[PDB]
Amino acid sequence: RGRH
Amino acid sequence: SYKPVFVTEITDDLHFYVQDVETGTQLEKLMENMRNDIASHPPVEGSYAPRRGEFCIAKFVDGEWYRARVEKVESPAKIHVFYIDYGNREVLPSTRLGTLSPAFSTRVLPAQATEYAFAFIQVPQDDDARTDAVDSVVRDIQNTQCLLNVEHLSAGCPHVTLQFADSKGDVGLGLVKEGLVMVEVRKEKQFQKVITEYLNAQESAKSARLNLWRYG
Numbered sequence: 001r002g003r004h
Numbered sequence: 005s006y007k008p009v010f011v012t013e014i015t016d017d018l019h020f021y022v023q024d025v026e027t028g029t030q031l032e033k034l035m036e037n038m039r040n041d042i043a044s045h046p047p048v049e050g051s052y053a054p055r056r057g058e059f060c061i062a063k064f065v066d067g068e069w070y071r072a073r074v075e076k077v078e079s080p081a082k083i084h085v086f087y088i089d090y091g092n093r094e095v096l097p098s099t100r101l102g103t104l105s106p107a108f109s110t111r112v113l114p115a116q117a118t119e120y121a122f123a124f125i126q127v128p129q130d131d132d133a134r135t136d137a138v139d140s141v142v143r144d145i146q147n148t149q150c151l152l153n154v155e156h157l158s159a160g161c162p163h164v165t166l167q168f169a170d171s172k173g174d175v176g177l178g179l180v181k182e183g184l185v186m187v188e189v190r191k192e193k194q195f196q197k198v199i200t201e202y203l204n205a206q207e208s209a210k211s212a213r214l215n216l217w218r219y220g
Contacts, residue, residue, distance in 0.1 A: 001147055003066045 006151035013091035014142045018127045021091025021117040038108045047102030063100040091117035122176040123155035123163040126186040137184040180205040183214030
């Protein structure tokens with residue numbers, strides 16, 4: 001929803 | 005029947021992977037429970053030596069563990085993995101991999117990412133044009149909820165239309181209007197309202213000399  | 009999806013990966017060939025929103029809390033629950041088990045029984049770096057086709061766990065750039073499939077074992081330091089619930093790919097050393105317990109297998113919860121392509125659009129052959137289209141879609145829909153309708157099958161994955169979940173605007177049509185892609189014409193009656201239309205959007209783009217149409 002990221003991921004980062 | 006448009007179905008709600010979460011778009012998680014856009015590929016360089018202008019395909020994309022999505023999760024079904026309906027099964028999203030189940031994915032989050034499985035990930036919760038899987039990581040609980042991992043925190044209680046921490047994988048030792050190098051204690052898993054992978055084989056092509058195996059499912060496993062892999063530690064992604066965010067430091068979290070996800071379900072993965074081993075696609076290619078190049079060397080112990082270069083294992084090519086596919087994140088089965090998201091659709092992205094990565095090369096990692098074996099020290100960032102672990103075994104996937106049967107409690108969390110694809111038989112307990114199927115792989116959550118499904119590959120799709122846009123209906124009624126040609127993927128640009130020119131690499132730079134293709135990159136522009138890909139980059140636009142990534143900015144448009146990556147990590148967003150969309151509505152998806154399967155239009156037709158292909159020699160590869162199914163071809164679909166996507167709508168932005170809030171605005172209901174057609175994503176693929178937006179690419180055509182921006183001159184980022186050409187229309188792939190379909191003759192079938194059920195597609196006529198959508199196609200002849202996509203072709204009228206391609207005219208808006210040809211006239212504004214946008215992107216593909218910059219030079220005529």
